[PDB]
């Protein structure tokens, strides 16, 4: 009667194996004392070198589990962990989850979603109204921000074929003779997806062409101009230009206005990368710092990073939803991504906003970016700790200045950082100098909390200089 | 922010956890057909009464049940026969509600730890049964598509790299011959190849469709003579495309004599097996996919036939270092996605948990019933079948303007809601379809459906 699937016969099953796990988590979450064990990629292999996967109940695969998994897993809830984009998550999120794998609905088309395909929409159609796209405009949720880039240089790619080659649709003949010449605009900045995108989309990383960017790690315009106009006279042909509202390194929001009247002059697709920077779509007052996000042609949405959501919740957006052709009353969904199969994430932002406020995300976000003045005020007065910007968002870059030494010195103490477990930092090279890195994305991280964490990088710091 | 999962939370995160447990029970308990009927345009008149600006879980939930729960196509619902959308296993679910709660990224080594190494041992498994060689790897992706325009991005990048010696495509773009290459599928394979040539900047054009056998596999001697004439023509054959398992016919392609054959060209073998993978567990009937260890790449999707929730997919190459196109142990140096969620649990906690041999018995079930639906619509005077099944699928119509009598019937069907049935299209003109994915579904339930179609069909030419 295949006893292992879910049905009516086996929902006294699911419950208890649900108890289980809440059982195991419980005990987990309240041992854990730090966000990290530091344990080594190779003293872990060292555990996994003998299970042979062609080979117990539940209650024995859970307690290998505690030892492969959760013992040493980096915990992101943890105050300490202030290291990359990775959120805390919030209740809704997890109640969508578990919704979620009992239905299994895929929001591809109708007939295997139903009141998921509408729900989709009412998330989307809600955050177009936060960015302020007009009318006509329309979005699709994709496995994250990757894709969504994917996806906007497809369509920048795409329209600009079809408005310049007359019904010379790329999508059936492939890429036109002039190919070769079209090139994107992003800050040296950006995220690699841009590049890894044009590759892709076979113009390869030659098409990107890097700006400069300002001593806020703004992308500068005047720089942009520049390049554009270095294009021209090279006969090359500009076409769009990736501006990013939230550099993954440095939290900085390119300069929107400008940027979208530099593209309107040269027939430039406008992308905003918001993948990062989309959370201020929820703050009472720091909404404003993503003006001129609504002149966008797309825009490119993580609510995985900066709205609380369990991976995979994001989301790709248009300005004029017939540009969405390219990649295609029944509404079907599939029609406008570049998956087939696919899971209703939507949930998860529809069941946060239906328990949670929208402005209790906002009281995040925002707690959040006062938290990162505050590390900021305390990294600067520390006169071993050279800082590099105030913060725009929620990072700040640093390092322990007691060049190539320096490098090797900031670069150890990440690493002894993380083998101590006591937390977790990133790091980052910004003109080829080893930075540090946090990221602040709890909103119950504390300022002693940060003063914890940037002594632990300075006792690590002085044992570089001074050996014990 | 008292909404963050964490350690204080732990009690309402149980409290909720329970109330979703009681609120599915009695949900899936009361679910007696696999649809409701209900329309777009009805359902959707509910909806614009929710205003997204304007709380709590059980007022959440409450509403949950009539804009979502309500109208849900049920897969579990032995009446739901329509395209790949498999049951799922409880392990899957037990591997969701972790996978929510630590919520890794599996992307890095500093993002999951253990995370990345059940990845790489999930992988590594399901290699062994595959049967590639040593430096072989693979990763998961969030389906069949983006494995497949994996598929064919290494198709594209290894072709260039080795012919047009230090040129990669990475850095300069699509090379001068570009425009000539070709990749040649059945007219049966999966529309995810077009688009991803498409995506890759050398169009549907860039696709030869391949003519079909009397059991709808791909013919190789129409494969031969396609190629042929592709190099008549000075344009440059570069890959194929095999499908263990099309989704319309569950049908499988010939895989040693296509790998033959592209291994004379030096072209790239892809085996999309996103269906026929299941077979890869079945006792018996693994050797029906034999040659799928002679690919370059494939395609796995455990989201269809390992009744592992979405998402759940994977990407197989035989050769590692072709991974490099798309470039401590990080997993990101052989994805085109950047974050990725750890999807690897529910396979790693179905094989611990379940046998990989519990996986393979149902899946043997299921093809034993499509054998019995075959005899029961074969039986059927009113009913035109077209195949034996090769998998889980049988492609059939009703035979009493024809195209648009199946196509209401379909349509009538899924407006009742005592079934759900899926359709197609084959040499233009269209078809009715059912897919068994479903152990628990039985003759009885098969001769009801039947029972339905031909009921409305009746009705389509009487008019009663
Ligand atoms: C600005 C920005 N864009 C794009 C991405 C890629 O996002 P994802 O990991 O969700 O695919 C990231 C990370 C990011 O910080
Ligand atoms: C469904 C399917 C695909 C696409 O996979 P998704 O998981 O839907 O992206 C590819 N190939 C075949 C044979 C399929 O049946």
Request: with cysteine; charged share 20%; glycine share 6%.
């Given at each position: 009667?295949?006893?292992?699937?879910?049905?009516?016969?086996?929902?006294?099953?699911?419950?208890?194996?649900?108890?289980?796990?809440?059982?195991?988590?419980?005990?987990?979450?309240?041992?854990?004392?730090?966000?990290?064990?530091?344990?080594?990629?190779?003293?872990?292999?060292?555990?996994?070198?003998?299970?042979?996967?062609?080979?117990?109940?539940?209650?024995?695969?859970?307690?290998?589990?505690?030892?492969?998994?959760?013992?040493?897993?980096?915990?992101?809830?943890?105050?300490?962990?202030?290291?990359?984009?990775?959120?805390?998550?919030?209740?809704?999120?997890?109640?969508?989850?578990?919704?979620?794998?009992?239905?299994?609905?895929?929001?591809?088309?109708?007939?295997?979603?139903?009141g998921?395909?509408?729900?989709?929409?009412?998330?989307?159609?809600?955050?177009?109204?936060?960015?302020?796209?007009?009318?006509?405009?329309?979005?699709?949720?994709?496995?994250g921000?990757?894709?969504?880039?994917?996806?906007?240089?497809?369509?920048?790619?795409?329209?600009?074929?079809?408005?310049?080659?007359?019904?010379?649709?790329?999508?059936?003949?492939?890429?036109?003779?002039?190919?070769?010449?079209?090139?994107?605009?992003?800050?040296?900045?950006?995220?690699?997806?841009?590049?890894?995108?044009?590759?892709?989309?076979?113009?390869?990383?030659?098409?990107?062409?890097?700006?400069?960017?300002?001593?806020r790690?703004?992308?500068?315009?005047?720089?942009?101009?520049?390049?554009?106009?270095?294009?021209?006279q090279?006969?090359?042909?500009?076409?769009?230009?990736?501006?990013?509202?939230?550099?993954?390194?440095?939290?900085?929001?390119?300069?929107?206005?400008?940027?979208?009247?530099?593209?309107?002059?040269?027939?430039?697709?406008?992308?905003?990368?918001?993948?990062?920077?989309?959370?201020?779509?929820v703050?009472?007052?720091?909404?404003?710092?993503?003006?001129?996000?609504?002149?966008?042609?797309?825009?490119?949405?993580?609510?995985?990073?900066?709205?609380?959501?369990?991976?995979?919740?994001?989301?790709?957006?248009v300005?004029?939803?017939?540009?969405?052709?390219?990649?295609?009353?029944?509404?079907?969904?599939?029609?406008?991504?570049?998956?087939?199969?696919?899971?209703?994430?939507?949930?998860?932002?529809?069941?946060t906003?239906?328990?949670?406020?929208?402005?209790?995300?906002?009281?995040?976000?925002?707690?959040?970016?006062?938290?990162?003045?505050?590390?900021?005020?305390?990294?600067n007065?520390?006169?071993?700790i050279?800082?590099?910007?105030?913060?725009?968002?929620?990072?700040?870059?640093?390092?322990?200045?007691?060049?190539?030494?320096?490098?090797?010195?900031?670069?150890?103490?990440?690493?002894?950082?993380?083998?101590?477990?006591?937390?977790?930092?990133?790091?980052?090279?910004?003109?080829?100098?080893?930075?540090?890195?946090?990221?602040?994305?709890?909103?119950?991280?504390?300022?002693?909390?940060?003063?914890?964490?940037?002594?632990?990088?300075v006792?690590?710091?002085?044992?570089?200089?001074?050996?014990?």
């Open positions: 009667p295949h006893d292992f699937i879910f049905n009516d016969h086996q929902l006294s099953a699911w419950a208890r194996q649900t108890e289980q796990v809440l059982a195991l988590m419980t005990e987990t979450v309240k041992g854990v004392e730090k966000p990290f064990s530091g344990i080594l990629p190779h003293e872990l292999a060292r555990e996994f070198s003998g299970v042979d996967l062609d080979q117990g109940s539940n209650e024995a695969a859970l307690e290998e589990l505690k030892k492969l998994y959760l013992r040493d897993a980096v915990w992101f809830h943890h105050p300490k962990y202030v290291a990359h984009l990775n959120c805390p998550v919030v209740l809704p999120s997890l109640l969508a989850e578990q919704i979620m794998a009992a239905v299994n609905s895929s929001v591809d088309t109708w007939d295997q979603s139903a998921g395909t509408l729900i989709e929409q009412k998330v989307i159609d809600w955050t177009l109204s936060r960015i302020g796209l007009p009318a006509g405009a329309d979005g699709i949720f994709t496995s921000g990757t894709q969504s880039n994917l996806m906007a240089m497809l369509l920048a790619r795409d329209s600009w074929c079809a408005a310049h080659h007359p019904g010379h649709l790329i999508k059936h003949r492939g890429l036109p003779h002039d190919a070769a010449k079209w090139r994107v605009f992003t800050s040296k900045l950006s995220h690699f997806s841009i590049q890894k995108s044009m590759a892709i989309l076979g113009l390869g990383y030659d098409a990107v062409i890097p700006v400069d960017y300002d001593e790690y703004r992308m500068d315009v005047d720089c942009l101009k520049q390049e554009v106009q270095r294009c021209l090279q006969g090359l042909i500009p076409v769009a230009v990736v501006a990013t509202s939230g550099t993954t390194d440095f939290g900085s929001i390119d300069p929107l206005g400008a940027i979208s009247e530099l593209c309107k002059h040269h027939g430039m697709w406008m992308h905003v990368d918001a993948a990062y920077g989309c959370g201020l779509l703050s009472e007052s720091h909404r404003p710092r993503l003006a001129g996000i609504e002149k966008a042609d797309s825009v490119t949405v993580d609510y995985h990073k900066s709205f609380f959501q369990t991976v995979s919740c994001g989301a790709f957006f300005r004029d939803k017939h540009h969405l052709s390219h990649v295609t009353g029944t509404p079907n969904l599939v029609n406008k991504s570049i998956q087939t199969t696919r899971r209703f994430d939507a949930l998860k932002m529809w069941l906003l239906r328990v949670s406020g929208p402005m209790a995300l906002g009281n995040a976000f925002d707690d959040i970016l006062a938290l990162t003045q505050i590390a900021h005020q305390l990294l007065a520390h006169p071993a050279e800082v590099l910007h105030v913060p725009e968002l929620t990072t700040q870059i640093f390092r322990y200045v007691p060049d190539a030494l320096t490098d090797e010195i900031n670069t150890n103490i990440r690493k002894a950082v993380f083998r101590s477990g006591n937390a977790v930092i990133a790091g980052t090279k910004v003109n080829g100098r080893q930075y540090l890195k946090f990221t602040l994305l709890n909103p119950n991280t504390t300022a002693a909390d940060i003063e914890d964490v940037i002594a632990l990088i006792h690590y710091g002085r044992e570089q200089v001074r050996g014990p």
